Amino acid sequence: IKNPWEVVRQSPLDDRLDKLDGKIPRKRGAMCRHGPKGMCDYCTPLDPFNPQYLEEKKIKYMSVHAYMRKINSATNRPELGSSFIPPLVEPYYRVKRDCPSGHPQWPEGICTKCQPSAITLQPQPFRMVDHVEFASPQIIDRFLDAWRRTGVQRLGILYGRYLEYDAVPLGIKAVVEAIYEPPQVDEIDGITLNPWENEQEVNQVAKYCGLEQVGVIWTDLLDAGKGDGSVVCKRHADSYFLAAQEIVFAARLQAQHPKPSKWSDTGRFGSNFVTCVVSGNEQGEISISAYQMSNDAVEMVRADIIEPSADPTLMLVREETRYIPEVFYRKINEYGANVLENAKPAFPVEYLFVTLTHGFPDSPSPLFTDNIFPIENREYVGEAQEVSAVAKALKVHEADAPMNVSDFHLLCFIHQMSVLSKEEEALLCRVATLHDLAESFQLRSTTGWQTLHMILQST
C-alpha cells in the first residue's frame, strides 16, 4: 500500500527546504582567469556540506538538509513516487520486528537476521537543529527569577517554532517565545519532575498561538559569592558539559518528539527537540549552552542499552527484555589511523550529543510582549496563580485601559478557567500573538469575553 514516507505530512519549513540545493555562490578568485560572468572550477558554487567552507566559518556540524544533499542523488525525490528510495534510515539497534525465520519472536527466539548489528559510536556530523534564538532576553530573565529568589535550580519547557537559519547552509533555528515551568521539586543540585497533568492543555494553548514544544531548559547555577551576580563555572573541559543522566533524559525527550520526514524509510527521522543549559562560563557570567542528543544516543536509550554511571562523564552499557549487541566507539591513535575501542563496560559521553549556537535576534519583536501574570508552579516562591491575578492583568475595574493579554501564562490560566469557547479562545490567542486592534475589538464583542469579565468583576 502507501509507504510511510508517502503518508507523513512534513512541516512547511521542511517543504520549503526540500526544494533548495543550498549551494554557496562564489565570486572570481585569485586563481580564476575569466570575465565577471564566466566560470571555472575555482568559482563554481560550493555544496552546503563543503568541509572547507564549514571549517572556514567555524561551523562544527552541517545541517541535516546539507547532510541529505550529501548522501542523496538530487534526482531521487518523492516526486518520482514508486521509484523513490528514501535516503535517510533512522537508527534501529533493537531486534527486528516480525521475523519470518521460524523461531519464536524475540523474547523466546532469535536468528542472525533479526539481531541488531554492532553499534559504532562516532561523532554525528550533522545536527537536526542548528540554532536556538530566544525572542527576547525577558524570557530567560523571567525564567531565572525562580532561581534568583530561591537558590535552587529550575526546569522549563521551551515553546516556540522552527524557522530557516541563514547563517549556515540550509540552517534551522528554534525560536523560543515562552518557557513553561512544569510541576517539579527543585534543590540546589538537582530537579525532580512530577506528573505534568495539563501538558495537553498547554499544548492546545500553544497551538492556538501557533507554537509547539521545541526543547527543554534547566539551570546549573551557583552564586560565586561576590555580590555582583557572578556565578561559578562548574561545566567545562575538566568536568562535564552534559551528565550521562542528563543525556538519557534529553534522549528520552527527543524520542517522544520525532520529526516527520518524507525522506525516511519510516516517515520520521531525528527530532527537533533542543536542550538548553543555563550555567556559568569561564567569565563567571550566566550563559546558555544548546545541545541535541545524537540519533545514535536516542536509539540506544530507546533500546535500553545504556545507562548513567557513577561518573557523569561515562555511560555504562547495560549487561544481559532487551538485547545487548557489540558496541564500539571510534577514536584516532597518535599515528592518525582510525581505531575501534570496545565501549563496554563504560564509554565517554562526548560521542552522544552535538552543540548548537544560540542568541537573541537583532531587533526583538516577540510574540508575547506583556509580563502581567504570575508564572505557573511557583507556589514555593510565594507566586500563586489566582482569578484575582487575571482580574488585575485584564484591568477589569479600569474601563479606560488598553487590552494587555500578550502573556502565555495568562493564556494558559484562562484556558484552565474553561470560559471561552474554542473559537473565542483561538481569537484571544491570535490577538495575544499578532496584536491586531480590529481583532481585539472583535474579541471584546464576544459573549465568552463578557462572561469572563462578569466572572472577574465579582472577586
**Site residues for Zn ion per CB under 5 A:** 32, 40, 42-43, 99, 101, 111, 113-114
Query: Please, which residue, 45 or 229, has the CB nearer to Zn ion?
Result: 45
Minimum gap (Å) between residue 27 Cβ and Zn ion: 9
Work out how close the CB of 303 gets to Zn ion at its nearest, in angstroms, rounded to a whole number: 17
Q: Is 34 annotated as a binding residue?
A: yes
Alpha helices in 177-323 (DSSP H): 199-208, 244-255, 295-302
Strands 327-332 and 338-342: antiparallel
Cβ closest to Zn ion, residue 43 vs residue 389: 43
For the bound state, the minimum distance from the C-beta of residue 98 to Zn ion, rounded and expressed in Å, comes to 10
- Cell 491575578 identifies what position? 389
Q: Kindly give, in sequence order, each residue whose CB lies less than 8 Å from that of residue 66, ignoring residues fewer than 6 positions away.
A: 22, 47, 48, 49, 126, 169, 170
Check the CA dihedral 173-179-181-186 and report its sign.
Answer: positive
Q: Which amino acid is at 252?
A: R
Q: Which is nearer to Zn ion, 104 or 137 (CB)?
A: 104
In the complex, what is the shortest distance from the CB of residue 112 to Zn ion, in angstroms, rounded to a whole number?
7
Cα gap 242→348, rounded to integer Å? 11
> What are the strands of the beta sheet with 338-342, ordered from one edge?
119-121, 327-332, 338-342
- Contact between 271 and 259 under an 8 Å Cβ cutoff? The reply is yes
Does the bond joining 345 to the residue before it have cis omega, within 30 degrees of 0?
Answer: yes
The nearer residue to Zn ion, 37 or 226, going by C-beta atoms, is 37
Residue 185 Cβ, how far from Zn ion at the closest point, in Å? Answer: 45
* Residue 42 or 441 having the CB closest to Zn ion: 42
Is 111 a known ligand-binding residue?
A: yes
114 is known to lie in a ligand binding site? yes
Residue nearest to Zn ion (CB): 32
The CA distance from 375 to 385, in Å, is 7
Residue 276 counted as an annotated binding residue:
no
Find out whether 32 is annotated in a ligand binding site.
Answer: yes
The reply, when asked if residue 99 is annotated as ligand binding, is yes
Whose Cβ is closer to Zn ion: residue 24's or residue 111's?
Answer: 111
Q: How far is the CB of 28 from Zn ion (least distance, A)?
A: 5
Which residues sit in the known binding site?
32, 34, 40, 43, 99, 103, 111, 114
Which residues sit in the known binding site for Zn(2+)?
32, 34, 40, 43, 99, 103, 111, 114
